Ligand code: HEC
């Protein structure tokens with residue numbers, strides 16, 4: 001079963017319940033290491049929909065209909081009883097990408113990339129290939145997903 | 160009824176959990192070695208999960224039921240720079256820690272939490288820990304019921 005609901009123009013409605021999908025990894029780009037203004041502030045927690053996770057464990061490929069959500073959160077502090085580093089604060093927003101060879105036949109890898117103005121928006125804004133796919137195409141380890149940073153995906157694909 | 164996540168020996172020791180990566184992620188933090196005298200206490204990234212039944216209960220109540228299992232997975236820092244900017248990015252898996260709340264199995268431990276260490280992903284079961292080794296820091300400093308919910312935005316957003 002596909003996990004992305006759409007409008008008529010194949011625009012992605014804001015995903016709901018993605019926090020109960022399969023988490024695949026977290027990174028952090030703090031503002032203070034990026035001239036006080038990270039591109040994606042700051043923590044990033046990333047999820048893949050459960051059906052696509054199932055298909056990934058079998059094939060090590062992203063099926064048609066894969067949805068991946070990147071959730072941004074703030075750095076809430078830099079020191080805790082466990083030591084120094086970065087610790088998350090409040091949610092900041094989300095980004096998403098959807099793979100569909102039928103609805104997006106001419107985008108790189110048949111991926112559409114979406115931004116969201118706020119948590120209350122009812123739908124995403126599809127982006128031009130220049131804005132997001134170009135960087136993913138140029139540097140992602142596998143099929144435009146930065147799986148070099150998702151150890152859940154790497155450990156979970158078939159041997 | 161809800162499912163029972165985690166299995167236990169007759170001495171009530173948690174068997175090494177399987178499938179916890181399909182549980183509910185509640186937040187990640189990072190204590191890099193280079194920021195902690197080249198040896199962090201829990202190196203380095205920590206990805207945290209709560210079992211799906213306790214997550215269902217937490218959504219309704221905001222408390223940790225009896226039978227709550229939380230798993231903290233450790234991973235190394237893989238790199239400090241990527242096309243998205245400077246920071247910290249995960250590498251390989253290092254190991255796990257876990258805590259289990261059960262007033263029937265652990266009537267005398269603080270909070271009725273049992274803290275477990277694991278010697279490897281290959282171990283059959285965990286090693287339960289003395290109160291000073293784990294529960295002490297957790298009871299003094301965690302925001303809620305010995306769980307550090309100040310670092311679990313999923314938990315804080317999901318409670319009623
Ligand atoms: C993370 C991201 C994800 C998660 C899946 C993945 O491929 O990692 C999504 C759905 C997304 N972004 Fe992309 N992005 C970049 C890198 C290195 C990572 C992982 C490391 C981290 O989390 O910091 C990403 C790289 C880039 C980038 C390089 C200059 C650009 C311009 C973009 N990303 C742009 C976008 C988007 C355009 C608005 C967009 C919707 C993204 N990313 C979504």
Ligand code: HEC
Pocket residue numbers: 080081082083188189190201205207229230231256257258274275276288292293294296297301305306307308310
């Ligand atoms: C994270 C942890 C978790 C996840 C649930 C939680 O309460 O956060 C578990 C299951 C666990 N550790 Fe504990 N721990 C500490 C802090 C600040 C955090 C969250 C921020 C982060 O990820 O860095 C924890 C603090 C401490 C601490 C203070 C010095 C000590 C002594 C311990 N933790 C000890 C233990 C354990 C004994 C070996 C053990 C099995 C833990 N923690 C498990």
